[PDB]
Amino acid sequence: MEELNIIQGALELRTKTVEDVMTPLRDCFMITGEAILDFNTMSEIMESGYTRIPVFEGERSNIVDLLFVKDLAFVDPDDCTPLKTITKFYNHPLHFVFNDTKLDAMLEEFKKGKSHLAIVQRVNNEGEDPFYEVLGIVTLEDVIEEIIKSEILDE
Amino acid sequence: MEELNIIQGALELRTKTVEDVMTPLRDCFMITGEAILDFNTMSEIMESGYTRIPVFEGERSNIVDLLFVKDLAFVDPDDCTPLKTITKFYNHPLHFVFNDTKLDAMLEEFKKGKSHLAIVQRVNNEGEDPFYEVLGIVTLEDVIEEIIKSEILDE
DSSP states (O other), rough: OHHHHHHHHHHHHHHHHHHHHHHGGGGGGOOTTTTTTHHHHHHHHHHOOOEEEEEEESSSEEEEEEGGGGTTTOOOOGOOHHHHHHHHHHHHOOEEEEEEEOOHHHHHHHHTOOOOOOOOOOOSSOOOOEEEEEEEEEEEHHHHHHHHHHTTTTO | OHHHHHHHHHHHHHHOOOHSSSSSSSGSSEEEETBOOOOOOOHHHHHOOOOOOEEEEEEEEEEEEEEEEEGGGOOOGOOOBBHHHHHHHHHOOOOEEETOOHHHHHHHHHHHHSEEHHHHHHHHOOOOOOEEEEEEEEHHHHHHHHHHHTTTTOO
16 A cells, blocks of 8 residues: 555654754764864775765864865865865855654744754753763764654655 | 645645756856955845855856855955965865756765765757756755755644
C-alpha cells in the first residue's frame, strides 16, 4: 500500500526533533580558529566528508565561526592561508536551535536564510549560572536526508 | 482526518516537477555580469526580495554566474565594487536541471552539494542545431516552500 508508507513515513518524520537528527558535538568534525589551511589541514578536512564545519576557540563547545568546505574548493594548500583570513572575510553568522525543534520549524529557518549549519542547544541548569549547553550540530543536508529517507516524495 | 491531508499533500508534492515550481526566466530578477555594485544597483537587488540571482551576459538566457545576496550583506555600496570582482572571486558553479525533474531528485541534487539555484532547461528542437532552452530558475527555497505548503510535516 503506497498510502500507508506515505502516512507512516510522515508520522515518523513529524516525531523527530533536531536532537534526533544532529551529530553530537563529541562526534563532530571541528576545527580551531587558529588553523592554517596548509596541506595537512586541508587533507584532513577533505577526507572528513563534512561540507560544513564548526570553528571553535579553546573549547569545542565555544563555536565562533562556520567553515563551508565548498568555499574551500579554490583555496590552495601551498599558500597556507590562515583560516582566520577565510572566516573573517566571509563572517558567516551563527545559527542556534533549541534541542526540541521539529523538522518543519528547521526547514522554515533555513528557508528564512539562517545558516545551513545550526548549533543545537539545551538549557543546562546543573553547574556552578545556567547556560545553554551545546549538544551538537544539525545541517541542511541532515534534514534533507531525513526527508529522502522518509520516502514521502518517492514517486 | 490528519492522515488524508498527509496523503493528499504527498500525492500533490509527488506530481510536481521543477517546471511547476520554477520562476519563469521572463519573471526572474537578473543582473548583467558588467554590473557595478553601487547604491542604485544594490538597492534594486535588496528591494527585489530574491536571495539568489542569476548573472547573465548579453542575453538573459546566457547565464554565466550566480549571485547570492547573503554574500552581499557586507559589501559597501559606496566602494562601487564591480560584480565581476565578486563573481570571479567566489566562482560559484552553475547547476542545470531538466524541466521534468521531480522534487525528490531536486532535493537529492542540492544534498549532493550542487548549487542552490538551478537553471531549468528543456530541449528546443525548433530553430535554425537543437539547443537547451533556458525556461527559468528553481531554488532550494522554492522546493522547501513546496514542502512546507504541502503540510506533510505539520505536527
